[PDB]
Amino acid sequence: SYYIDADLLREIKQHLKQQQEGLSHLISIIKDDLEDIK
Amino acid sequence: YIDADLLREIKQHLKQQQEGLSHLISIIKDDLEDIKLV
Amino acid sequence: PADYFRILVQQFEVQLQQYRQQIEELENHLATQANNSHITPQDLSMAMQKIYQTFVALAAQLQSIHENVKVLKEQYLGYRKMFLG
Known part of the structure; x- marks a missing residue:
């Protein structure tokens, strides 16, 4: 058994998609x- | 960049993984x- | 070291090595500012999802290792009651 915050993980996903890269x-x-x- | 808040989020996540293991x-x-x- | 024990120690080392590599690759990327500039935000999104998939595997193995050492103690305790009282 292992406790890990899922809300924080998907929060990391959002911030990654939101942030855009210069072509x-x-x-x-x-x-x-x-x-x-x- | 990368954003500093997203860094603290990542660091916290990886730390949670280590604590779990x-x-x-x-x-x-x-x-x-x-x-x-015994 | 039977088969069950040997396959675990081996399967457990390969995931351990992966996890070790993946972390070091990520820490280095996020280490220096100029280093992060050499990767896109979607590389992180990959690394993150890769390290997690490994972490889940490692956690599963460590859990099964706990289960094995547990039966080891039980059997060991069984024999002791048989031959030592």
Whole structure:
């Protein structure tokens, strides 16, 4: 048996969806990845 | 960013996970210790 | 170390290693400010859901380990009453 606050967990989900990412930045990360892997 | 309130939320959540596992580990340790005591 | 005991110790170590890696990967990301900038908020949403799925597994194993050590004590107690009084 393990106690963990579920209200806090879904609260973390909301804050993650609400927050949006700059497309221009989102692409810089993708580029960097492809390069960093190849 | 990332937001600081969302950080404190995450930290609190992960901490809750550790406390949960640690609690179970404590029960196991008690069981092992009581075995020696019989 | 029978099969039941061996499969648990092994299945319990693989989840332990996963959890260890996932946490360190996340802590490092949230460690420095420049580090968070190298990941999207939806990467966290992943990591979080991944670490939790592992946590649930770990918690299940630790629980079953508690159950095993419990029957160990009971059997051990059974034998003692038989051969030691």
